[PDB]
Design a protein around this ligand. Structure first.
Ligand SMILES: N[C@@H](Cc1ccc(O)cc1)C(=O)O
Ligand SMILES: N[C@@H](Cc1ccc(O)cc1)C(=O)O
Ligand SMILES: N[C@@H](Cc1ccc(O)cc1)C(=O)O
Ligand SMILES: N[C@@H](Cc1ccc(O)cc1)C(=O)O
Ligand SMILES: [Mn+2]
Ligand SMILES: [Mn+2]
Ligand SMILES: [Mn+2]
Ligand SMILES: [Mn+2]
Lengths: 346, 346, 345, 343
C-alpha cells in the first residue's frame, strides 16, 4: 500500500536564494572583481595570456575567521606576482566523501551534526562577499545542483570534482555556470572523461533546476566556452611533461583547448602534503624548458601545515592535509620566477 | 557588473509532481505490486530467497506502445517462471551519454529536440502506471535529483549508473529512495566505488531537494538498507566466477551484502549484443555449480533485435543494441532451468 | 507561543498552471473572450447601444444543467444579437450573510468536504466548454487567488455589494482583463461604487499569487472599463429618477455615466416573480429615453424558484430564479424595447 | 491572461523576515498574555477598559517609537484601570486613491518597496513589544498577516471590509482577538454577522509562511467583538450602546463592545474625540456595563498634513496631540476606577 517517501525521515524549511541575496547583495567592487577575473581566466584558458592561474588555499573552509586571515596574507602575494601569476583563493564549502563524513561548512556549519544548512549558506555567502570586497577572488567546487544559486555570483572559477566529472548533471550544471570551470580527471586517472566533459559543458542543455525564489524549473543553458581539464593524478601521478604532452594531443584531437591545469595535491602528491612542493618544482622545470600547455596549478595550502580530526588548532585543515604559510611563500616564489621566464621567451 | 546567469539562455515553467500525481494517481493494484516487489527484491538482496531477479527490457524507452506490447509478452514469462525468477521490466527514460546525445523520453519525448519536459514526465508516469496496472513491475535508472519525485512511487527497483556511482549527490538520493537500488561498477571496472556507494547510501543524509509541490527544501533521509552492487564490465568483462568471488570477498570485507547482480550487456558483452546469451550461459553454469553470491541479472532486450539510428522500425532500440524476442525466450528458459537446480539444493 | 494557533490545517493546493495545462484555452474561446470584452467596453463608454444582459443562475451547483441552460440561452443570444449582448451568469463564489455553502469552488460535492482542487478543476472545465460552444461567461470575483485559475475565460466580472467598498477588491479589479461592474452597497449606498470605479481605473501594487502558485508583488495598469450596478438598497433603485440621480453623480466624479440595473436581489425584494416587473420598468425607460442604461442583470434557471437541497434538476439552491419560460418573455421584452432606443441615434 | 498587469515582482516570503527578526521570548510572553487579557475583557471576566490608542497611520518608525515610549509610562501608571495597547496601523484604506501606508510604500514617494516596508513593519513591531508596548493593527490584506501577526495582540477589521466574506474568513483564523467596525453609514448588523461568521471554522485559499498558496482551514475566532465608530450620525452615547447590546444578545454573541472616539463619532473632527471620551466616562460612572474598550486617534502633535513635513504629525486622519492624550487617558482611568469599585 504505502510506496512514497518510505525512507524520508523529514523535509525541512529552506530559505530561498533571494533571502540571502537581499541581506548580502553583491557590491559594486565585488561585481567588478568577479567580472574581471572571469575574463582574465578565460584569457588564460584560450592562450591569449601566459600568466599562470593559481588556485590556492585550504582543502576545506571550516572557520571563516581563519579564512579571512589567510586571505589577507595571500592578497599581498597576489599583488606582488600579478604580472606572472593570477592568484585566486580556494574557498571550498562542499566536500565529496569516500563513503561518509563531514560534507562541509554549508551542509553542517557547526561541525557537530546539526545540519544547519540555512546558517551554512548564509555564512558561506558572507565569507565570499567579504573576500571579494577585500580584493581576493574566490573559487569553489560545485558539488550540489541547488547550492550554486546562493553564491555563484561571487565565484571567479569553479571546479567539478574527480568523482563527478563523468556525471551528466554536473556537466549540465557547468554548461550554465557564469564562471570558467575546470574538470578533474577520474579518481583512477581517466582523462577522457574530463575531455568529454569540456565537450558536453560547451553545448547548450536543458535540465531541471531551482530558481532564485526556491522553485523548480526548467533551465536552458547557453553552454560554457571556458572549460579546461585538471590533471590530478590517478593510480599513478600525471603531472610530468610526458603526461602533459599526451593530454594536449588528446585535447587537440577532441577540438578543445589544449591548455590545462595541474593539481599539486591529492593523487599527484600521493595524498602527502610534503610532496606538493616536488610537483610544483617539476612544473617550474616544465615552464622553464617550454610548458606551453600549462595555464594553471592547484595547491592545498593553509595557515598551519598538516591536518587534524577535530577543529582544535586554528588555521589547520580538518580534511586533506595542507602545506603551511611558509611553504606557500616558497612555492609561489618558485612558480612566479619560472613563469617570468616562460613569459619572456614570447 | 553583470555576474549572475551569464550562460543561462532561459528559465522555463515546470509543472510540479503534484500536478502529475493528481491526473495519474497510483491505483490500489499498482500500489500493491510496487510494495510487494520491493519486498521480494529486498528478500533477494539479503539472501532470504534464492529466486533470481531479472531486470530485462529495452536499453531505452522511446515508444510507449511498443513498451506495452513488450510488457504483455514478458508478463506471460514472468508468470511462467515465478518460482525461479522474479522478472521486472527495464523502463529506462534517462540515458547518460559519453559526450553529447539524446538524453531520453523525459528530456525530449517528441524525438525532434524540442525538450518538452512537462509532456515527457507526464508520458513517463502514464506508461509506468499502465505497466504496473497490467501486473508488470518496473525498474529505471535515476540520473537526475528532481525527476524521481514524479514517478519513484511506480518503481520497484532503481539503478545508479556507472557514471554516477561515485557521485555523492547520487548516493544521497539513493539513501532516500523507497526502492532497492543497484550500484554499477565504474566504466573502467572499479568495484570499490560501488561498494563505497552502498556504504554511503545505507546511512541517513541531509541534502537539498525538491518537494512534491515543486519547492526546494532540506531533505533528511533514513538510509537505504537494500542496495547492492552490479557487475557490468570494465577494461575487461567481470561476469565470470572468479570476478564474482573477488567481488563477494570485497563486499564481506566492507560489511555489506555479498549478493550481487550481473549485467549481461554493456561492457560485459562488448561489441556484440548476442554475446548476452554467452554471459547468461556462463551465469547458468555458475548457478548450477554453486553461484551462491548471485541474486540477479540484467539483460537488454526488445521486440526486434539490434539497433537503428532513427525510429524507423517498430520495437527496435535506438540506443544500445538489444537481443530480440526469440533470444529472450531462450535466455529466460536457460536462466530459469539453471536456477531451479540452485534452489533445489537447500 | 503566538503563531498559527487558530489554524486547524494547511492543505495542498494545485497551482493554476496545473489546471491550465489540462484545460488550455482554445483559439475559439480566446477569440470569443477577447471580442466580448471589447464589445462590453463599447457599451460601457456609450459607443454602442445594445444592452448587455448578464443572465443565468444565482449560483452554479451542477455543471450539466448549466450546460443545458447555456444551449437554450445561446439560441436567444444569437437571435437578439443586434439588440442584446447576452452573457451567461456563471457564479462559482457566493457571499453569505453569516455562513453557508460558498459555492462550487469552495465545496463542489455540496456536502462540506471542501474539495477545492476538484472545484477549481470543475469550474474551469465548465467555463471552457461554455466558451467553446459560443456562450461567454461572467462571474463574481470574491476571492483574491481563485481568479488566476479561470479569469482568462471570463468576459465580464462583478464585485459584489458586500465588497465594492473593499480596497483589495478594488485592487483586484484594477488588474482584471475583463470589464467589471461594481454593485451599490447592501443598504443602497451608491458612492462606494462610484469611488470603486475611480480606484480600479488606476494602477496599483498589491500582493498576489502567480500562476505557479507563489506570492508575489503584482503591479496593475488599471481597468478603464468599470461601471456601476444598481441592485437596490433599503428601497429599490431601478427607476428613471434613481437612474438619473446616479448618472449625474457619475458625471460629477468624471467617470462613465452608463450603468447596469439588476432586476433581482434588493430590486425585486427577493421575489423572483418581480424581476419581470423591473424589466418592464426598464423596457419603458428604454422606449422613452434610457440613455444611461447599458445593461441588466437577471437571475434565471431552467426551473423557477429555489430549494434547500439539490433535489430537483435545473432549480436553484441559492436565490430563487425565474424559469425558462419567463426568461424567454423577459428577453423578448428587452430586445423589443431596446430595438426602438437604438433606432433614435 | 494579464491584459492589465504591468509587472509581477520579487516578494520575499514570511520566513525570510522571520529568520532575520525572530520573535523574542519576552515579545512572545507579552503577546500571549495581552491576547488573554483582552479575551477576558471581551467575555466579561475583567472590567478594565481596553484602550487602543495611537496614530491613524504609522509613516515614521522614529516618531512611533518616541510616541510608544511616552505611552508606556501611562500604560503602566493606569494598569489597574486600563489595558493600553498602541495603534500600529500600516495598511490604510482610501476613499478612492492615495498613499496606502508604510508597507505598501515606505519611502512615501511612490516606489512601492514592499519588501523593505514589510521588514520595517516587523522590526518596529518587534522593538515595540520588546520595550513592553503591545501592538494592534488593521488587517486589510490576506497575505501581509503572515509577516507579523505573531506580534499583534489585537486586530481590527475596517468599516469598509466588515461585510466582506474573505475578511471574515481571515479573522476566523487570526490568533488575536478581533474587533469589527460597523459600516461607514452606521449599519451595525454587518458587524454582528461578522462576529457570527468569524467564530466558525472556514476553508479558503491563503499563503504559507514559505510564500506558497495553499488551502487554509481555520478553527474559528471566539474573541471577536463589535466597534461603534459612527455612521451618518454618531453612535457612542448610552442609548446606542444599550440598543447595540440588546442586538448583540439577540444574536447570541458577546454584548461587550468597543467605542471609537474618532472617525464618524467625532464627525471627522479631532477636537471632538475628547467630548466622546467624556460621554464614555459619564457612562462608565453611571453604569456602562457593556463597554469593554475604546479607540483613540492620537499622536505626538495634533492635526494632519498632506506631506510629512512636521515630525509626529499625522498624514492621514487628524489626531489629537500628546497633551490631549494625557488628559483623555486620565479621564478614562478615573471614571473606570469607579466602575470597577462598584461590584
Ligand atoms: N520520492 C522519493 C524520495 C525523494 C524525495 C525528495 C527528493 O528531492 C528526491 C527523492 C521516494 O520516496 O522514493
Ligand atoms: N546562478 C548560476 C547558474 C545556475 C542557474 C540555475 C541553477 O539551478 C544552477 C545554476 C551561475 O551564475 O553560474
Ligand atoms: N490573471 C488575472 C489578473 C490577476 C493577476 C494576479 C492576481 O493575483 C489576481 C488577478 C487577469 O488576467 O485578469
Ligand atoms: N498567521 C496568522 C493566521 C493566518 C494564516 C494564513 C493566512 O493566509 C493568513 C493568516 C495568525 O497567526 O494569526
Ligand atoms: Mn582536498
Ligand atoms: Mn544500454
Ligand atoms: Mn443571487
Ligand atoms: Mn484614521
Amino acid at each position: 500500500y504505502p510506496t512514497d517517501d518510505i525512507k524520508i525521515k523529514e523535509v525541512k524549511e529552506l530559505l530561498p536564494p533571494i533571502a540571502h541575496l537581499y541581506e548580502l547583495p553583491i557590491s559594486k567592487e565585488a561585481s567588478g572583481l568577479v567580472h574581471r577575473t572571469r575574463q582574465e581566466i578565460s584569457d588564460l584558458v584560450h592562450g591569449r595570456d601566459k600568466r599562470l592561474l593559481v588556485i590556492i588555499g585550504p582543502c576545506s573552509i571550516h572557520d571563516p575567521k581563519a579564512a579571512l586571515e589567510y586571505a589577507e596574507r595571500l592578497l599581498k602575494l597576489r599583488k606582488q606576482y600579478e604580472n606572472e601569476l593570477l592568484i585566486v583563493m580556494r574557498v571550498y564549502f562542499e566536500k565529496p566523501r569516500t563513503t561518509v563524513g563531514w560534507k562541509g561548512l554549508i551542509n553542517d556549519p557547526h561541525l557537530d551534526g546539526t545540519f544547519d544548512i540555512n546558517f551554512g549558506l548564509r555564512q558561506a555567502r558572507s565569507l565570499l562577499l567579504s573576500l571579494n570586497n577585500m580584493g581576493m577572488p574566490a573559487s569553489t567546487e560545485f558539488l550540489d545542483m541547488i547550492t550554486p544559486q546562493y553564491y555563484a555570483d561571487l565565484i571567479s572559477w569553479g571546479a567539478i570534482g574527480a568523482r563527478t566529472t563523468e556525471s551528466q548533471v554536473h556537466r549540465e550544471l557547468a554548461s550554465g555556470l557564469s564562471c570558467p570551470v575546470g574538470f578533474k580527471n577520474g579518481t583512477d586517472g581517466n582523462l577522457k572523461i574530463a575531455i568529454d566533459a569540456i565537450g558536453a559543458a560547451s553545448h547548450s542543455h536543458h535540465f531541471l533546476g531551482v530558481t532564485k525564489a526556491g522553485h523548480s524549473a526548467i533551465v536552458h543553458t547557453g553552454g560554457n566556452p571556458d572549460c579546461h581539464v585538471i590533471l590530478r593524478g590517478g593510480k599513478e601521478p600525471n603531472y610530468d611533461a610526458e603526461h602533459v604532452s599526451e593530454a594536449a594531443e588528446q585535447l587537440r584531437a577532441a577540438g578543445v583547448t589544449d591548455k590545462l591545469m595541474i593539481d599539486c595535491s591529492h593523487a599527484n602528491s600521493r595524498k602527502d602534503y610534503t610532496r606538493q612542493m616536488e610537483v610544483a618544482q617539476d612544473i617550474a622545470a616544465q615552464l622553464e624548458q617550454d610548458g606551453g600547455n600549462i595555464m594553471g596549478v592547484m595547491v592545498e595550502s593553509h595557515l598551519v601545515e598538516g591536518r587534524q580530526d577535530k577543529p582544535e588548532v586554528y588555521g589547520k585543515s580538518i580534511t586533506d592535509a595542507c602545506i603551511g604559510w611558509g611553504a606557500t611563500e616558497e612555492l609561489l616564489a618558485l612558480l612566479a620566477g619560472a613563469n617570468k621566464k616562460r613569459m619572456a621567451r614570447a
